[PDB]
A paper describes a structure:
The cryptophycins (Cps) are a class of macrocyclic depsipeptide natural products derived from species of marine cyanobacteria in the genus Nostoc. Cps destabilize microtubules, thereby preventing correct mitotic spindle formation and inhibiting cell proliferation. At high concentrations, Cp-1 and Cp-52 destabilize microtubules and cause the formation of curved tubulin complexes and rings. Cp-1 and Cp-52 bind primarily to a site on β-tubulin that overlaps with, but is distinct from, that of maytansine as well as those of rhizoxin and PM060184.
Therefore, we have determined the structures of Cp-1–HeLa tubulin and Cp-52–HeLa tubulin rings, to a resolution of 3.4 and 3.3 Å, respectively, by cryo-EM and further characterized the binding interactions by molecular dynamics (MD). In our Cp-1–HeLa tubulin and Cp-52–HeLa tubulin samples, we have also observed the formation of rings with 9-fold symmetry (C9) ranging from 24% to 40%. We also solved the structure of Cp-1 C9 rings to a resolution of 3.8 Å. Image classification indicates that the majority (ca. 2/3 and 3/4 of the Cp-1-bound and Cp-52-bound particles, respectively) have 8-fold symmetry, most of the remainder have 9-fold symmetry, and a very small fraction appear to have lower symmetries (not shown).
Numbering used by the authors:
A (entry chain C): 1 to 436
B (entry chain B): 1 to 429
């Protein structure tokens, strides 16, 4: 009974959106034509499922969300596809020319041209809402129409709705799928003006996710329809508390407050150890305990880092059906082994556990299948310093000789802000190495 | 995506453009009169980049045939694909343009660049989105370095926003009819470098060297050389004609490949070295191909990759072959000799694969590189020109047409500045 807003920026933000929203709709059984067995045929709903859908005179439950993309490719496919019909008509916006791997075009030449139409759509659609907790945004680092449009859009939104929130689900650069090498410049050049408005972010490192899909999903070509299905499952798990119905981690405010140790440092790691091979029939059997028994290993996390070499802040979870909280507290006893766990002196610790009773509903025939149970660790661990450190290393190496600088300099922003942003992230990593 | 304008001038660009267009139109497979010959829709998904619909939903390209020797019209119409070009872009001067600047660079044809600009504008208007310009010519003699560079000046004056690509042809003592070339060369770069975006040093020297040493042709005429060039440039275009992971685009190609706003002298190469043979012959396999990518014989410019560090590396692959193994090979090449890839930029190499095989062979690769190594070509031009200029020669021609000598001196200074800059950028860490 608490609405929200979703948004998808770039061709990477729209792809994730597409691979996720089928999971959302099928999860409730919402087909393009389905009757949604819990309705009233006019606005019937207001359970947690409808907290993201607005119903027309047809009881259509059209998503309160937009897809944004200046270069038209994936969006055109959405238009041909049934998904656009499911979506609110004309909500989506189609562009004409991307910035193409240069933050400034989406921040100083191209993004500003249509950013007003974007925010106009935002306002008009938003005033249809009453109980919005905040913003759920999808983007990543690559170009100015996928990283800069986000920065500008956050600026405008944070101005417009001082009370509201915004959660970030961003995709981290990886050398393995390099479609540029300006990308680290993009990432820094955004995050240096994102913390000031964002309050809670999520980075899913495709590098690690690639490592997952290559090894343990038995797909040997990482197509932008493999990683995306897996990552879309990640999104369904994390959104599960809010999205399905009442449990722990009710609110986005609740996310912040149970993961923020400090307003600046809002980078929570996400964890999802329980996985399956494929539509393959049978491999073994697995219960609720063993899965968190194996949720410790450093190679079962969405971002490469050693959680054993750091301390946590708070750790929520979710579980799917098949309730047995007694064995959950038994797992709590088991995890005292401390061989990969350690906490902070002044702050009280909570392994908050909430339950939801739905087995994992998924796509008909994807690279994954039915299982009985799972659990996802949301640790805002200080260990994420490793990723920022590596990215700084790469950044300094490329910036020692003013690489590509003109490809930004002549595009409407000066050079020196590179240095101040670099020292900004230097302050942030200082804050990590201090905490503890 | 958007639309691009194709420009061909001189003789190499006029004839060489004809053969290139032949190759691409055949592989994309549309009838000479425009009947749909393509056998899969993926062919026609992007073909709007370089072909436009006629009044009856029928492809007509968007290209501009410019020259000043009147004989080019008949020589082009006498090729296989010579008819299909638009019968209004054959703008030709009739008084001949013997290989001397400032007759076309300054004296005449400056009258005609207004006409070519008018026609290119009225052409691009119907282009729903304009993406840039495709200019092919040869850095040799008058036309191809005269009208072409003036046209670059004009288009950069009128269309700053879009990008500009050049396919450049460098003559050399082996196959060189005329004599005044080095003068023309340096005169041309001294405008190119300050008025272009990225380049294609399609060397004749090493390319003849291939045709004569290993490809074993003792009589390489304008037949064979256009063969190789049409193959190479068509391959360069395929990354664009197809969809792909590295869907590199003009602006994107630049920004991924151009480290500093000057040093954009690319070094295209080709791994399956070929004749105009009726047979593909040589089976070529990918582990071998990756090794072949850097082969000195393979390259289309006069340089040693081993003696050079690459500023950026781009690769394109073709055919039905395993994607994973290629990546494995690429990681392997990077590891053995770290120095060949520059320390400044990590992970410079970018790899994509294209579904359709090149028409003729089974599986190959199309190199697009940029090392500091490109400096060897510019050093040969430097040496040759400065030798011919230490004492005067023919200088009355250019001077009496309205040139001077300070322009020559400033051009040579510009050149040696460029080569010094390359040398410096290949010695940092
Ligand atoms: C990072 O490290 C940690 C972080 C958090 C925790 C405990 C963690 N957090 C707090 O900071 C507790 C209290 C203060 C307050 C904060 C400081 C101000 O917003 C408050 C507010 C004001 C008006 C209305 C609603 C809320 O939050 C809350 O009221 C929310 C309840 C709502 C958001 C579901 O919090 C919870 O109780 C929910 C059920 C989740 N959990 C917690 O019990 C432990 C550690 Cl170690
Ligand atoms: N969907 C998707 N995108 C990915 C994946 N891995 C990387 N990407 C990113 O996808 C991005 C492409 O979208 P953008 O970043 O918006 O690209 P752009 O050049 O700014 O603009 P467009 O190409 O028009 O979207 C690149 O930055 C890649 O880094 C993946 O697994 N899925
Ligand atoms: N026609 C032609 N010329 C080439 C080719 N490759 C190199 N060249 C050289 O390019 C120069 C021709 O210059 P050209 O464009 O004819 O000058 P113009 O007389 O002003 O048109 C000569 O030095 C040729 O040796 C090629 O494939 N075709």
């Amino acid at each position: 009974m608490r609405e929200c807003i979703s948004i998808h920026v770039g061709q990477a933000g729209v792809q994730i959106g597409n691979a996720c929203w089928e999971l959302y709709c099928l999860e409730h059984g919402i087909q393009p034509d389905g009757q949604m067995p819990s309705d009233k045929t006019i606005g019937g709903g207001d359970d947690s499922f409808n907290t993201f859908f607005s119903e027309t005179g047809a009881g259509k439950h059209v998503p309160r969300a937009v897809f944004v993309d200046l270069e038209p490719t994936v969006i055109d496919e959405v238009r041909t596809g049934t998904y656009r019909q499911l979506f609110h008509p004309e909500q989506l916006i189609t562009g004409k020319e991307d910035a193409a791997n240069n933050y400034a075009r989406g921040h100083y030449t191209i993004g500003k041209e249509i950013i007003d139409l974007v925010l106009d759509r935002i306002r008009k659609l938003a005033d249809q809402c009453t109980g919005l907790q905040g913003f759920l945004v999808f983007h990543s680092f690559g170009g100015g129409t996928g990283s800069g449009f986000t920065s500008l859009l956050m600026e405008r939104l944070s101005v417009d709705y001082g009370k509201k929130s915004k959660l970030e689900f961003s995709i981290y650069p990886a050398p393995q799928v390099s479609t540029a090498v300006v990308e680290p410049y993009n990432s820094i050049l955004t995050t240096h003006t994102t913390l000031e408005h964002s309050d809670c972010a999520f980075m899913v490192d495709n590098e690690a996710i690639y490592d997952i899909c290559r090894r343990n999903l038995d797909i040997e070509r990482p197509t932008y329809t493999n990683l995306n299905r897996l990552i879309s499952q990640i999104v369904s798990s994390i959104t599960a508390s809010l999205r399905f119905d009442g449990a722990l981690n009710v609110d986005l405010t609740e996310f912040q407050t149970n993961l923020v140790p400090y307003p600046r440092i809002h980078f929570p790691l996400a964890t999802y150890a329980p996985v399956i091979s494929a539509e393959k029939a049978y491999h073994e059997q697995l219960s609720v305990a063993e899965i968190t028994n194996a949720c410790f290993e450093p190679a079962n996390q969405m971002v490469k880092c050693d959680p054993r070499h750091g301390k946590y802040m708070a750790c929520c979870l979710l579980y799917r059906g098949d309730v047995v909280p007694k064995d959950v507290n038994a797992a709590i006893a088991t995890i005292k082994t401390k061989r990969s766990i350690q906490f902070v002196d002044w702050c009280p610790t909570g392994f908050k556990v909430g339950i939801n009773y739905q087995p994992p509903t998924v796509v008909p025939g994807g690279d994954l299948a039915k299982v009985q149970r799972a659990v996802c660790m949301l640790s805002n661990t200080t260990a994420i310093a490793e990723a920022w450190a590596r990215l700084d290393h790469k950044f300094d190496l490329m910036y020692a000789k003013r690489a590509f600088v003109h490809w930004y300099v002549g595009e409407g922003m000066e050079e020196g802000e590179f240095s101040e942003a670099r020292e900004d992230m230097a302050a942030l990593e200082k804050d990590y190495e201090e905490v503890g | 995506m958007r639309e691009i304008v194709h420009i061909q001038a001189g003789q190499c660009g006029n004839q060489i453009g004809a053969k290139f267009w032949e190759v691409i139109s055949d592989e994309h497979g549309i009838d000479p009169s425009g009947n749909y010959v393509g056998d899969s829709d993926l062919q026609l998904e992007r073909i709007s980049v370089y072909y436009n619909e006629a009044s009856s939903h029928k492809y007509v390209p968007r290209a501009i045939l410019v020259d000043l020797e009147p004989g080019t019209m008949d020589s082009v119409r006498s090729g296989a694909f010579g008819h299909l070009f638009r019968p209004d872009n054959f703008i030709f001067g009739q008084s001949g343009a013997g290989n001397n600047w400032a007759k076309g660079h300054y004296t005449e044809g400056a009258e005609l660049v207004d006409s070519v600009l008018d026609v290119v504008r009225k052409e691009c208007e119907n282009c729903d989105c304009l993406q840039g310009f495709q200019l092919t010519h040869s850095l040799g003699g008058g036309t191809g370095s005269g009208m072409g560079t003036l046209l670059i000046s004009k288009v950069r004056e009128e269309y700053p926003d879009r990008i500009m690509n050049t396919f450049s042809v460098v003559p050399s003592p082996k196959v060189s009819d005329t004599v005044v070339e080095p003068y023309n060369a340096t005169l041309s770069i001294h405008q190119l470098v300050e008025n272009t975006d990225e380049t294609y040093c399609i060397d004749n020297e090493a390319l003849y060297d291939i045709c004569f040493r290993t490809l074993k042709l003792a009589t390489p005429t304008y037949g064979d050389l256009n063969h190789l060039v049409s193959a190479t440039m068509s391959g360069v275009t395929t990354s664009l004609r197809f969809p792909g992971q590295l869907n590199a685009d003009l602006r994107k190609l630049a920004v991924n490949m151009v480290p500093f706003p000057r040093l954009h002298f690319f070094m295209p190469g080709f791994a399956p070295l070929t004749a105009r043979g009726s047979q593909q012959y040589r089976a070529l396999t990918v582990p071998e191909l990756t090794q072949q990518m850097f082969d000195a014989k393979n390259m289309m410019a006069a340089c040693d990759p081993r003696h050079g560090r690459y500023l950026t590396v781009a690769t394109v692959f073709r055919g039905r072959m395993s994607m994973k193994e290629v990546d494995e090979q690429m990681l392997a090449i990077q590891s053995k000799n770290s120095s060949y890839f520059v320390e400044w930029i990590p992970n410079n190499v970018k790899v994509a694969v294209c579904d359709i095989p090149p028409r003729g062979l089974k599986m190959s690769s199309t190199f697009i590189g940029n090392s500091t190594a490109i400096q060897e070509l510019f050093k040969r031009i430097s040496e040759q020109f400065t030798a011919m200029f230490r004492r005067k020669a023919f200088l009355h021609w250019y001077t009496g047409e309205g040139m001077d000598e300070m322009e020559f001196t400033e051009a040579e200074s510009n050149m040696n500045d460029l080569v010094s800059e390359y040398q410096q950028y290949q010695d940092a860490t």
